[PDB]
Design a protein around this ligand. Structure first.
Ligand SMILES: [Ca+2]
Ligand SMILES: [Ca+2]
Ligand SMILES: [Ca+2]
Ligand SMILES: [Ca+2]
Ligand SMILES: [Ca+2]
Ligand SMILES: [Ca+2]
Lengths: 225, 225
């Protein structure tokens, strides 16, 4: 199967040590898109933020924010698949008796709730969260309180359906456990040199580079650029 | 959306207090099926065993064994999605330096490997397994050495395509942790009164019953009988 679409984790794979966007990665993406590849970006940040990457970086596929819970379309519209009414309420309550706190970007969230929390309160909040049908994990700039099933697997399955692709026509690039939901799918997989052992274990290609420089080598390996 | 297909995990949902099949559950399935419902059964058993359930229980849809890795189709054929060459090899090697041992039913396995092991060796073996792209867990009658992504979510997604349904037209019934994958999909969800706390929290309908009695209640709730 020839790769037709690549779903990339923004924070895990397109940035450097200082979290700045990698320019070589941007050039690799543009070069590959010029050759027919469709690219989709996925992030835990808010939709206007990933929207900004779409228009400035030049992403030709849809982009997702809030870990797959909200997407910006090819027709310029925004669609969310989960609501933040419950996660927002959970935060309001927990913040009354824990260090769990709201973050600035929550003002632009629509399908989940981001937060900061003292490491000591993580175990307790996670148990309360799961008893409520939510899950929590960290990615990018913060922790994210999400609805169960609101993840990257959801987003990649959505892309597959939107583009009528076979799983093997899809390549996913990630780096850690919060990317496992999409790596456990029957898609093609690639990761950076600093990816977790479990992600490397199931990847079709493990790059010799990281911090954005794995994109160019990955695409060259799959003959996409 | 109206439910058109129910994907049901056998163990803990179709079994009673003695891990025996519930006769009330069997009659409930046959009744719903007469009224138009397609039912699919999933479990960790080998394919001839779930095949036995299909023909004697009277299941009108596909059945899955080895936790989703092998299916007995509507055309009397068996389709395997993963291979057991690698996992069988792993068990062979590990058995030479750990308590991990093959089990009789592996004589009928085709897409994964079943096993027994002393509890204290679990950690050593899981670490070795994950470094090879496999996973291990206990369910039903033994431990299971699976390929990453070989699960009930893989199976339900397959049913979705096979029947050209939308996730909202699919109802899943499960109760234990290895059933959680189906619950992470955008399908309709239900569980028995004694399902895990996490499953209960993400289910749309939680039954007042268990040991097979929940199937009737669940079907009625969704106007399936
Ligand atoms: Ca990641
Ligand atoms: Ca990273
Ligand atoms: Ca973020
Ligand atoms: Ca593959
Ligand atoms: Ca058991
Ligand atoms: Ca079960």
């Amino acid at each position: 199967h020839m790769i037709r679409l690549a779903a990339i984790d923004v924070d895990g794979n397109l940035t450097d040590r200082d979290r700045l966007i990698s320019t070589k990665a941007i050039e690799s993406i543009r070069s590959a898109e010029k050759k027919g590849l469709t690219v989709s970006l996925l992030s835990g940040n808010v939709i206007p933020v990933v929207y900004a990457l779409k228009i400035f970086l030049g992403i030709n596929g849809p982009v997702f924010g809030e870990n797959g819970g909200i997407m910006f379309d090819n027709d310029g519209s925004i669609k969310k698949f989960f609501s933040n009414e419950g996660t927002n309420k959970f935060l309001e309550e927990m913040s009354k008796r824990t260090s769990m706190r709201s973050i600035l970007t929550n003002r632009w969230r629509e399908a989940s709730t981001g937060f900061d929390i003292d490491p000591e309160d993580v175990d307790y909040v996670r148990k309360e969260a799961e008893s409520r049908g939510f899950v929590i994990f960290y990615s990018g700039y913060s922790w994210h309180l999400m609805n169960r099933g609101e993840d990257k697997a959801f987003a990649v399955n959505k892309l597959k359906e939107m583009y009528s692709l076979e799983y093997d026509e899809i390549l996913v690039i990630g780096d850690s456990n919060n990317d496992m939901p999409m790596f456990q799918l029957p898609v093609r997989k690639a990761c950076p040199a600093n990816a977790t052992d479990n992600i490397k274990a199931v990847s079709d290609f493990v790059s010799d580079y990281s911090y954005g420089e794995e994109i160019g080598q990955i695409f060259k390996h799959f003959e996409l650029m």
